[model samples]
Target chain A: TTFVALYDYESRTETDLSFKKGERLQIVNNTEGDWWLAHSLTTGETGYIPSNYVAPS
Target chain B: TTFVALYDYESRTETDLSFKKGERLQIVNNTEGDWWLAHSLTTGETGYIPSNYVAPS
Candidate 1:
């Protein structure tokens, strides 16, 4: 369930998350398709992000 | 469905779409969760974009 951000993302909406590059995020659910439900281990933020923005860690 | 771009998006990945502000994007599939499958009327390109970046027209 370990995923790492490839780029810094500033949340444009409440449904998204703001993450810095190299931040570790937990994949909570990926069944949603290209958008994965994730949780940031460092910031404790939960939101959906494009799967392409992160890679398995 | 008709959706207009709220901001310019330069795609970071192959699955993403690059569209300018005010561009009309045809929603092919919104069931893919926050990332929607869309087609651009102006560019004739098909890809996915965040639902938050568009609005119904």
Candidate 2:
């Protein structure tokens, strides 16, 4: 599945993925409760994102 | 603040932090909604962890 960020997010650590609003990310894993593992299609980076930060696309 | 893992979590990605139950972590950042950036006192690793998986101590 795919998702689009609703707001800009600046990662707090190197382990987090940073992205701007409207960027698309492919969901890699969503079984981690409120956080989903995703790959940023725009930057080709992968990390954990809050589920509420994006909407299904 | 410090938190103790309420349950074990096996991270799906390298960006996510994996921890076992009863482990302690020092919260580095808690402004990221459901995911908090924390430092594992046991392993000395830092990453994002699901807020629900831990409780403040």
Candidate 3:
């Protein structure tokens, strides 16, 4: 039901600083890749799925 | 319990253009009107209630 999904990531050396779920990030882009940011919603952590996922909500 | 109200609006009339509570908005100007924006909250719907209202919970 709730889990982390790897969307976009920045690879570094042998690791990816790329963000998953439960991570921290400010919305840099509106729609792109997973398009997830650190914010609060009714259903806890949510990505670009619901229309609420739209920007400037 | 009393401060700024009137809910700023882009009105050219008798300030009749006001914002209603519960309706979200993207604050074009901070510290103006209700300082609310087009958005949402964990509690279903919400407007620029207070500093408690921001983005990305």
Candidate 4:
């Protein structure tokens, strides 16, 4: 399922994305590690995020 | 409901727990934003974690 950010994230990695609260992010892959690969529509960027920041959208 | 860790978690907060892969974690609460409060039996610790790292156990 896809999700929307509940809070802003100041990325901890270069490949990670920075998103504002309420921003939209689609789940690209979540079965890998503690971090999930996601895509942001606002910036058209793909990055890793801590999964709890988002909820099914 | 409770869960088990699919991957290890190196906490970003001092109040958070550092657990290994396959650790046992019980759900404490999830109403908060971006982080779910959980408990670890390995260290008898409690902390927040990205929700996707565990599944209902």
The DockQ of each candidate is 0.04, 0.08, 0.03, 0.04
| CAPRI accuracy category, model 1 | incorrect
Find the number of clashing residue pairs for candidate 4: 0
Clashing pairs in 1: none
After TM-score superposition, what is the CA distance of residue A20 in candidate 2 from its true location, in Å?
0.7
Q: Model 2, stretches more than 4 Å misplaced? A: A30-57, B1-57
Q: What is candidate 4's lDDT per residue for A1-57, written digit by digit as tens?
A: 434445654544333345555544443334332444334443343433344433443
lDDT of each: 0.45, 0.48, 0.25, 0.41
Q: What is candidate 2's lDDT per residue for B1-57, written digit by digit as tens?
A: 334446655666457555555544442344444564444443344455444344443
Q: State which docking tier applies to candidate 4.
A: incorrect
**A22 in model 2: Cα distance from truth in Å?**
0.9
Q: What does fnat come to for each candidate?
A: 0.02, 0.09, 0.00, 0.00
TM-score of 3: 0.17
Off by over 4 Å in 1: A30-57, B1-57
The parts of candidate 4 lying over 4 Å away from their true place are A30-57, B1-57
Query: Which order, best to worst by lDDT?
Result: 2, 1, 4, 3
Each prediction's RMSD to truth: 19.1, 15.9, 18.1, 16.6
Q: What is the iRMSD of the candidate numbered 2?
A: 16.5
